Design a protein around this ligand. Sequence first.
Ligand code: ATP
Ligand code: ATP
Ligand code: MG
Ligand code: MG
Lengths: 200, 200, 156, 156
Amino acid sequence: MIEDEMSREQIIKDGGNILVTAGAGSGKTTILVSKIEADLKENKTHYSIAAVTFTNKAAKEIEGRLGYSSRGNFIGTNDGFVESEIIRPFIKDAFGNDYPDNFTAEYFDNQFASYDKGLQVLKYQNILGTYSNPKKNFKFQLALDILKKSLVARQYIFSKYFKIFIDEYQDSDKDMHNLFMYLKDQLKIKLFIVGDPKQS
Amino acid sequence: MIEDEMSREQIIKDGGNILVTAGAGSGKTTILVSKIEADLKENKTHYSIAAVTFTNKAAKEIEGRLGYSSRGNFIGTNDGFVESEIIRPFIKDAFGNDYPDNFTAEYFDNQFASYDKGLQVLKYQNILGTYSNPKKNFKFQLALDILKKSLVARQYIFSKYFKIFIDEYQDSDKDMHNLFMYLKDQLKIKLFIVGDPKQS
Amino acid sequence: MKFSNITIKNFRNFEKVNINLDNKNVIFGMNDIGKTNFLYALRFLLDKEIRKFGFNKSDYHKHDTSKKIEIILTLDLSNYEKDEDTKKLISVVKGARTSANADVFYIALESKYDDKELYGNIILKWGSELDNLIDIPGRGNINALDNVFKVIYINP
Amino acid sequence: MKFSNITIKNFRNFEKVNINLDNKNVIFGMNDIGKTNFLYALRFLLDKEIRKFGFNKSDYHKHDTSKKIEIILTLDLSNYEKDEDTKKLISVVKGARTSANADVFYIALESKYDDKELYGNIILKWGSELDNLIDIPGRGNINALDNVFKVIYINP
Ligand SMILES: Nc1ncnc2c1ncn2[C@@H]1O[C@H](COP(=O)(O)OP(=O)(O)OP(=O)(O)O)[C@@H](O)[C@H]1O
Ligand SMILES: Nc1ncnc2c1ncn2[C@@H]1O[C@H](COP(=O)(O)OP(=O)(O)OP(=O)(O)O)[C@@H](O)[C@H]1O
Ligand SMILES: [Mg+2]
Ligand SMILES: [Mg+2]
């Protein structure tokens, strides 16, 4: 049945942590839709997935290929995943009752590169900026501090999702790698990573 | 029978503008809730009334004395009435979609005392401050400006609200008087003003 | 003030049917052609006792349950003065009217089938444009469409 | 994980009744004393087909219809590890839990009578503290409590 269906049988029947180092093109999207459909067919329980992309039209095409379901699965970007599932329900739980609940995501005006100063901007000015250096993220370090401080957020992430589908892993910082290793190692979540190494 | 029932027929069955020369307190709350329950008894159409107070203790005391009403009658403070009835449903229809919908009143940091720097910090920083002059109202001036600007806000408060019951008029600014005169002269809303004998 | 249009998509025997309306509408036709499925499209839109049971498999076009049931009603609203019913509509809506489009209104119904719970949930919307239809707000069993319209159904 | 308590206020033949529970509950008593009015308080809370019709005049204590019907149920949730039903509750709720009160949960029901439209609307709530119970989110005819609990009512 040659190497393509042999790699398909190796990538469907294995339910562990899968690291994919593919090339340019050659159908990452259709093998993602087939792996997501095989995982949703195989799981009988109440658990859920989080398809994470970098561009929202590809997640819109993935949701158009899949359809409508009532299992509460998340399809979207990384910024929408951190903004909906991490920061906004648990920002009052992690940093006390004096911190505000709602915020507007605007990282184009503030360029402060300090941690406690960024906490003072998100306390006082009620905006969510970013660091001046492009290798560091204020938002993903804030998500790491929310999952380090709060107990309810770890219980929600461990109860809700069983497999996080990450697309385009190569344009990611070390804070996203530390947050995904914190989600994989400490919370025992099976992680799915695709992407092509190098190739600009 | 006789002049007591004739005086009760005069002071209960009024339909126009009411201005009673009575002092502050001394049983004005009981005749105010009697006028409110007589106006709720005498009305059979789809219209609704409004009640404006200052403190939340008299607001929950009035809410304890009425109980439950299903006609959409609003009882609250002036800033909550302006925020939840004038500002929030009509800022997107008056000044475009660049201004945010949800907002919090945090005046403990910004002490800006001009209208132009106030509108550019609602444009940029998306927060509202307070004037250095304590006899000012930025929110009531904004409500008067977007009631002058929007057509559907005038259509909604002409279609819904019938009378406004005002408490504690002795400590008020001229901008609230200008906005209540703007509601009085054009959009045909009666006024119920209590006051003071002299000074106090 | 005045009804103007109804657009029925993917319902029981209507695939995409647009009907201009008025006040005092009289519908007629043959036997088994869809006269009382037109009136059930008005009962599912505007009456709560029909709408509280949801949609079945047989409420979809040719038993398909992969299309979206969409029933949109257009109101005219050109006479704000002298008509009490325009004030009755405008005093409940409060937040989806626009002053540039103040002489049209839309009340829409959407439904997508679940095919796990075996249930078609009905989501109602209004707006003043056909894009940006916000959801009708409601608490419990009661939304704000039931505060405006009362539907009397007569059948001997 | 475990049921703990139910507090029934201003219902049919219960004025203010607090009952400690567990899993595997058995109720007994005389005739015309209210055993079947205990089980309809669980049908109005946790089942949607009873909840969709609201409350009548006869569901209130001594036909008063000026008191508020309130039914509050308490869940234990002390065993997050080894139990799957704790994760089935926690994965739907997502924002009403607090780390100071992570091992208690409350599901409440309020109802106040209209006495113009002659109807009792039912508003459900959850939280982890008895003060600041937010409303259950929901779209259409479905809220998020229906994704957790399924009630099987057996009566010969
Ligand atoms: N889900 C469905 N899929 C396909 N066809 C359907 C569906 N539901 C109803 N129909 C069709 O719609 C018609 C229903 O008849 P209906 O009662 O609406 O007609 P009518 O014009 O009111 O009749 P009459 O004049 O005899 O009172 C039938 O032809 C039936 O086959
Ligand atoms: N709204 C109400 N207000 C006051 N009393 C009420 C109300 N509704 C019911 N009751 C009373 O509750 C009782 C209803 O009896 P019910 O059927 O609950 O008894 P039971 O214990 O289940 O009986 P059995 O064991 O014989 O089946 C009657 O005494 C009736 O008068
Ligand atoms: Mg017919
Ligand atoms: Mg019984």
